[PDB]
Design a protein around this ligand. Structure first.
Ligand code: HEM
Ligand code: HEM
Ligand code: A1H6R
Ligand code: A1H6R
Lengths: 386, 373
């Protein structure tokens, strides 16, 4: 598909398998690997027992006692993705410890070298990203039952009662519900090129319907996450080392790079499905010199390369918004607005979630709300009719 | 062959072919100011002429070439207005009569409202004789800032190197088709031709010494090409009166905005934008300052399989040697350019550009580390 895009121009008449978008789970990693080869048992033991090793003060010693394991026995993408999740969770636990302020600024070579090597191979930074902790950190309990919260579990957690299962899985379920609108993207671009007004209108309504369905999926957050544990426990382990006063220069990846490196912590700003619909609908979240725009643009380098490629390819295609704005067609404008309105409804509900889980507990924050309010505002201002 | 939707010309590559030299008569007030910047600046009459302008509508710029020329005109006027005589007395508000059509035209071309490489280098040129080839002797720039500023030498030598490197672009489809069809001999020959084009571009670079002098470049030209992003002289940015309420920050024109140099780093798997470092962040940010079709071309190149990974996986010395000849040619360009920056920035600053050298040395080292052997 890439070869033909060079010759015929950027036209997304189909979703090429090279973008690694699954029909069922979208940007999520389909059926993630749960076990590494026996050679990596020492990594797996630490990753699977982070809550106990952290609480007992034995984690840093277990990490320091590791031998440097070669990454050559991780032969496929899924084992490399699991290894990235394993090493990333271990790195977070090692750096932050019990989460009370005693930090480690040097990641031992026995973990830092295979971590950075594997990160270079997957073109991802050596820090836990949304693609690790949400997109690859899951399993079905029963392979014969559908993708529901009851039939799912996470592979790794940080502390007991940290609500990592609820937080990661509800993000994953919303991510998967929104992904059902991705298969409609080629229909939208083909309808525009072939000037098929009724096909375009029906496609825009189907995308709006998928995004509306994703809002219902979001409601489950309240049943599986509690504000105290999320704010005081989970939030500490998901911090990065970029502009972080606790690690002002970054982290030393011993044996791999000489100087400490700064990397931003895992963020849902790294979700490709939400950036995908903002690009598709011409909600220029990444335009201008604003902080919100710069953050979302920077988060693309923290997405898997095929997903980052998908986003810039969406950007290279003609504008759906410009097409709809030029047609003097109420029905088409209304269908476009139903997609934008569904995104505004998701972001408005999400702002209420952030008030419950971050704002109120912090008072017993405002920079996070201002970012979210800017993204939401840019979305609301994209509506053709109020 | 590469799609016409990418707007890569067969002869001048990413440069704008035969740029428009005159705007419609309606825009005579803009053109008079832009064509007389050296005199209006020196005499202290420029800011008054800009303040005396009526707000002209951009609707009479009907094609891409007239919109590109208008962007060059407004951008040069904006730089002269902001920096004045280049002695430190700055303007922090761009008057609405220029700021509004500038921002509107910039939104239309999907470019920020500041002079970019695509304005001042890619569209700021003409042939003296249309029947003679693209040589320095047969070329001139459309706009300069001050007399003796060496803008002709600096802009044209950049343009000539940009055009020489562009001859390797037509080989890109051959490289990707050869990889997909598993045509080893075709791929080897393609890599050797790209190395040959990059070697030729180094010779073109040597001309800089004949047309630019360190004193005038450092003390005069450098001042007019500054932007307002992290600039202590305009710490909050520039007010684009009538268009945005708050001041906005935009980086100044940079060769980090050249699409042809970013293209060969993407093609050869030199991950200049990877790693979280400042150099990577800068080159990534500069893509939003390129014309959208050229930014789309870079995305498309990035979406194709890695040439480096393909060559590394074949256990083929001849193919590795051809790939290494491309990387070596890029290292040689960057090493020569570092010596130029020592002559034109480092030494004049001492009679201080160390951050600029560190950025260039990071880019060069990332290129050197891509050699297979
Ligand atoms: C406990 C509940 C949640 C909290 C406290 C929360 C918090 C946040 C915060 C603080 C940000 C700002 C960026 C950052 O700091 O990294 C953010 C962004 C975002 N969140 Fe959540 N979130 C929650 C649930 C979810 C769920 C279930 C999803 C669905 C996948 C989601 C999707 C997003 C997206 C896509 C963004 C990027 C900004 C936007 O596109 O509007 N969040 N979230
Ligand atoms: C008077 C001579 C020159 C000086 C002093 C000079 C200076 C600089 C400086 C300071 C930078 C860093 C970026 C910035 O600050 O905007 C830079 C980058 C760059 N320059 Fe030049 N330059 C000269 C001639 C050229 C020429 C003739 C070309 C050819 C098109 C060129 C191509 C580049 C490229 C492609 C970059 C980006 C970094 C890289 O890819 O290695 N320069 N230059
Ligand atoms: O943006 C971070 C986050 C995710 C992280 C979990 C681990 C990797 C991705 S999932 C989620 C859904 N909404 C926001 N998302 C943010 C970090 C700071 C605390 C609040 C959460
Ligand atoms: O990076 C700037 C620059 C260019 C400018 C000219 C006008 C718009 C793009 S051309 C050139 C070639 N090499 C470096 N390039 C900037 C120029 C002023 C001095 C500091 C460096």
């Amino acid at each position: 598909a890439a070869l033909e895009v060079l010759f015929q121009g950027p036209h997304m008449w189909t979703i090429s398998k090279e973008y690694h978008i699954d029909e069922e789970v979208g940007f999520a990693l389909p059926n993630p690997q749960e076990n590494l080869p026996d050679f990596y048992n020492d990594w797996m033991f630490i990753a699977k027992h982070l809550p106990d090793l952290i609480e007992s003060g034995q984690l840093r010693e277990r990490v320091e006692k590791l031998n440097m394991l070669s990454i050559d026995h991780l032969t496929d993408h899924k084992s490399q993705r699991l290894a990235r999740l394993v090493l990333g969770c271990i790195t977070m636990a090692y750096v932050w410890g019990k989460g009370h302020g005693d930090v480690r600024k040097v990641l031992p070579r026995n973990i830092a070298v295979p971590y950075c090597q594997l990160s270079k191979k997957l073109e991802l930074p050596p820090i836990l990203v949304y693609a690790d902790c949400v997109l690859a950190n899951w399993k079905k309990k029963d392979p014969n039952k559908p993708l529901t919260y009851e039939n799912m579990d996470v592979l790794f957690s940080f502390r007991d009662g940290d609500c990592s299962k609820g937080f990661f899985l509800v993000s994953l379920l919303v991510e998967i519900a929104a992904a059902s609108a991705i298969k409609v993207i080629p229909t939208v671009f083909k309808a525009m090129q072939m000037q098929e007004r009724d096909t375009l209108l029906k496609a825009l309504l189907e995308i709006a319907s998928c995004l509306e369905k994703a809002l219902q999926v979001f409601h489950q957050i309240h049943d599986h996450v509690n504000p105290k544990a999320f704010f005081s426990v989970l939030r500490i382990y998901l911090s990065g080392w970029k502009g972080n006063p606790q690690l002002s220069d970054g982290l030393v990846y011993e044996g791999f790079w000489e100087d400490p490196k700064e990397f931003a912590g895992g963020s849902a700003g790294q979700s490709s499905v939400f950036q995908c619909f903002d690009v598709l609908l011409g909600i220029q979240q990444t335009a201008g010199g604003g902080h919100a725009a710069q953050f979302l643009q920077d988060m693309r380098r923290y997405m898997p390369p095929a997903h980052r490629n998908f986003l810039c390819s969406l950007e290279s295609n003609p504008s759906v918004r410009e097409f709809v704005l030029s047609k003097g067609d109420a029905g088409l404008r209304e269908a476009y607005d139903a997609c934008v309105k569904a995104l505004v409804s998701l972001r408005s509900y999400h702002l209420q979630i952030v008030t419950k889980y971050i704002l109120i507990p912090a008072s017993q924050g405002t920079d996070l709300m201002n970012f979210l309010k800017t993204v939401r505002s840019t979305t609301e201002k994209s509506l053709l009719k109020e």
